[PDB]
Write a protein that binds this ligand. Structure first.
Ligand SMILES: [Mg+2]
Length: 389
């Protein structure tokens, strides 16, 4: 398949080569808050299609290690600036200070032909004084003061952190940063504040809502989920982990890496994870215990899933669905809006009893097509689909 997302990255510092291969061609870049790539992948990450974005975490970073790493990786194209300088417990730099030290990063960007990402901000506890305001917590008041102190400074991108749990809050809050007229990097996000996700499925729904919004926002240059693996583990609140055992994904990690960009098109024959729909009405996410697929979509009613196909060899394909359904369930299949097959009285006897149901052949001409999977007032689980010729 083509590269699944050009924007999608990951925040994690302990990749193995097997971890990078598990996500290959579904994750484009990553960063680790440090000046060089993870030790076990430093030599080979570029061969799996990734680019690594180094970071100057605060003003006292190790410039020698960063310049030395850059010397041997001319594939590096971007440099992240200070990390949460408006937080006391992080980089702890008032706007003037962060601009004062910015030439160190420009000199680096000049020597290696790099682009510079602004210091990452978020609503802060307010303990780094911004001049001329009492609202020291304010990420926009911080960046304004930064930019006014940084006259003539090379700043190519904005970096944003966000831990809101509501996808509409998230899109409103990240959109506020489009005011600066620069592409945006959401370099840390997950649903976490105000109680966060009630369960793993809530986090997967929130990841899906916000990933889909960012893939459709042209002003978002890049995003990276927080984070590859957590100290607490993937089934502990707030269910952050994208990677499970070496070289394998969590259910959430399957949703994260499967969601396609606007222009990506699936080639066939292929198996396509259900969580890789270009478009979801109503469908929700859960872990599955099926032997493959990691995550399922769940239907209670009339939910719709659409899959955008680049059919290179027109002809008749059989469509297979991997389903679970306690009772009788009906599923309509459409191509560019017109019914072609209906799965009737699907019944596996349990919500985690899985079977593969095949259709009669469906004619799929060469070109661009929307494959639509509609629940027909049915209650079932949907792991992946397969088209074969
Ligand atoms: Mg799946």
């Amino acid at each position: 398949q083509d590269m699944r997302s050009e924007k999608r990255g990951l925040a994690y510092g302990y990749h193995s080569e097997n971890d990078l291969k598990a996500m290959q061609g579904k994750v484009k870049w990553w960063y680790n808050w440090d000046t060089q790539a993870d030790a076990n992948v430093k030599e080979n990450y570029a061969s799996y299609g990734y680019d690594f974005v180094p970071m100057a975490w605060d003003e006292n970073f190790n410039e020698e290690a960063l310049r030395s790493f850059l010397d041997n990786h001319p594939d590096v194209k971007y440099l992240l600036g200070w990390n949460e300088p408006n937080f006391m417990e992080q980089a702890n730099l008032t706007p003037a200070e962060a601009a004062a030290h910015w030439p160190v990063l420009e000199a680096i960007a000049q020597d290696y032909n790099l682009k510079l990402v602004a210091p990452a901000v978020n609503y802060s506890p307010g303990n780094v004084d911004i001049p001329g305001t009492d609202d020291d917590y304010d990420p926009w008041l911080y960046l304004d003061a930064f930019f006014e102190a940084c006259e003539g400074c090379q700043v190519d991108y904005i970096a944003v952190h966000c831990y809101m749990k509501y996808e509409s809050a998230f899109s409103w809050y990240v959109g506020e940063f489009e005011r600066y007229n620069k592409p945006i990097w959401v370099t840390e996000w997950a649903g976490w504040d105000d109680g966060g996700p009630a369960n793993m499925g809530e986090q997967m729904n929130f990841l899906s809502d916000t990933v889909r919004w960012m893939e459709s926002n042209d002003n978002i240059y890049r995003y990276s989920w927080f984070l590859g693996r957590s100290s607490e583990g993937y089934d502990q609140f707030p269910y952050l982990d994208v990677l499970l055992a070496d070289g394998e994904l969590t259910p959430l990690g399957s949703v994260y890496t499967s969601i396609p960009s606007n222009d990506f098109r699936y080639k066939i024959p292929a198996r396509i994870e259900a969580e890789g729909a270009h478009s979801l009405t109503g469908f929700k996410h859960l872990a599955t215990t099926d032997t493959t697929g990691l995550a399922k979509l769940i239907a209670a009613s009339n939910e719709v899933a659409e899959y955008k196909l680049n059919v290179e060899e027109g002809g008749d394909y059989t469509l297979a669905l991997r389903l679970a359904s306690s009772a009788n369930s009906d599923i309509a299949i459409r191509v560019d809006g017109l019914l072609v097959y209906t799965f009737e009285d699907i019944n596996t006897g349990g919500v985690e009893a899985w079977m593969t149901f095949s259709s009669t052949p469906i004619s799929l001409t060469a070109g661009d097509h929307i494959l639509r999977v509609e629940s027909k007032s049915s209650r079932f689980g949907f792991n992946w689909l397969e088209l074969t010729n």
